[PDB]
Amino acid sequence: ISVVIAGYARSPFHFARKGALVDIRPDDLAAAVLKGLVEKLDLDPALLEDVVMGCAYPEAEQGMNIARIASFRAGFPQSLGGATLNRFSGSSMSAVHYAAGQVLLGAGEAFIAAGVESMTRVPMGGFNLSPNPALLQDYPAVYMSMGQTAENVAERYAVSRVEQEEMAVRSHAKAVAAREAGLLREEIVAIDTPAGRVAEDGCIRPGTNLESLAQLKPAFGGSVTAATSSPLTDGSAALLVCSEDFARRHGLVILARIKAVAVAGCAPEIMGMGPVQATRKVLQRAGLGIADIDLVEINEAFASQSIACIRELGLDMDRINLDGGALAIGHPLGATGARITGKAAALLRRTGGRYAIATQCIAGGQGVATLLEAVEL
Template identity: 55%
Template structure:
């Protein structure tokens, strides 16, 4: 069975939805941009790409019409390269990487572009037509789609105080700002031209303080603990990685970043969807034949500080190994694009930090977790 390698990673800057620099950019253009830049950076001929496997959490409107095919066409890939859209909500683009790895293992191709796009400016979270199943009661609907309240529930159930959440959020911004200032984030970003201006920086990173975070009102529950500051912001962005076989990498003179060692998905109660990473990570670690002690790098999505910190504790992830360049609270969370950022980032960090094992994981609305273990190549 062929092994799958991550051999390149690029993303757009991530900016606030509706008020950020990319708010007027169509999601297809964001996607095409990262594909073009990934090919340029790796030097791979687009004709060699079997398929574009593309994550998108709300594939409708401008993100509809099989955006996976559209972004490939707009990027200038030959018509012979196919394209598919993957939807596992926030886990869509980790799933896209796994689907590419799976096809590779089944000898159904040598090279794939996996990635994702989400413009939360142009297609709102929950889409334009929110039509929950009619026999569900309001509580079931709330558990399934009102993720802010699930974060409140996790905070209560796992004993996360407001201050602990604010500290987590502050750490995320501090790490991200430091990485932004010394150019670590710039290495993964392909600046996007908007009306003659290069948008090169992530727009959600804040130079904030614990005091400022502590002064914010709660966002989802009166008397609760979760604020806009301890939640990932609505974000626009796109990400892409090159997934290929070892033979393909050698033939094209590529230096792979990491091998896809294992993968897992899991389910949990929708009302505490933020705990999804716990079981999926445990399964993925077991499938890779390692434990958390072996892990050098963890890229875990920070949908909310409450769930991320609760998962960190449950999985015994050392703080210094978690999201070393900041997480989604600071960087943003363009839903369907986030998974590939986590995989690409973990693979990149394994190289940079000279680690061996990396874990990319995230929670998913509706009560799921997704995890991928990477081994440095």
């Protein structure tokens, strides 16, 4: 069975606490994106087997199996399944991997693989934090801050502050170029809020420049700053993962075929390097080399780790994050894996490429990757 991505939708992404989505509960935000996806495809949600929702902190407003809450809030029929999946920042990419496996098993033909984070309304870390006392004593790197891991990569992989800032300039310039060309509009579901309808991304900072960035304070006692870190973000993203036969029968435009998937573990103290081994695994599984990949969506958790991974894999920077990356677009942890996988698929179709990879790092030392191919191949 050929497994494809045949739809991609997301909310605008906004800053936590200070942006336009602070009043929207994450279950309602996710439900709006689920509804917007099936409406853009003119697809009866009764045809869906299951909704798998990535969420890094699935508690409080993100609790009670937010996949199923969001499905009911979207008015989807009770016949669907729903399950919530936490692999921190990679959650909704693992939702794609889950769905792709069920398609291959013949355990249903059509799935939503989605994610959500309201970093406003469920702050990163959750409530009632309770680290394991034995690991905290014997293996403290398990609970290392993300910023310290970013400094560890900057030091050990030799990514200077100025190199990090150059990536922030390019991420924002590419995001602005894409936004101004209308190239972010089709993937967006506008969201209704008390202040009105939100249709545009909020984290992009046009005219980001080296001189302004050099004035910022270090965020973590070293090279990294707020500008070279993904911001705290609210957002949701959703993909239709289905058999190729299902997509063709319902007249859906196929963005890409899923050719290979992977997870890989790494040292937690340098968790930002997760993408290297996860990318090498999809390449090996696909029978491809890095030189075969037209474009990559590598999540910009921090410039230090994104650059370090790009260099280690031998990637051309001109093939990275074509319409901007998370330093500009934002990073609502549970939602990002669906966004970068869907965006990689939509970009592969838009550019007429053959292969794409979406990949990202994960707290606790992991990486995930997805290798996409043009469905014609």
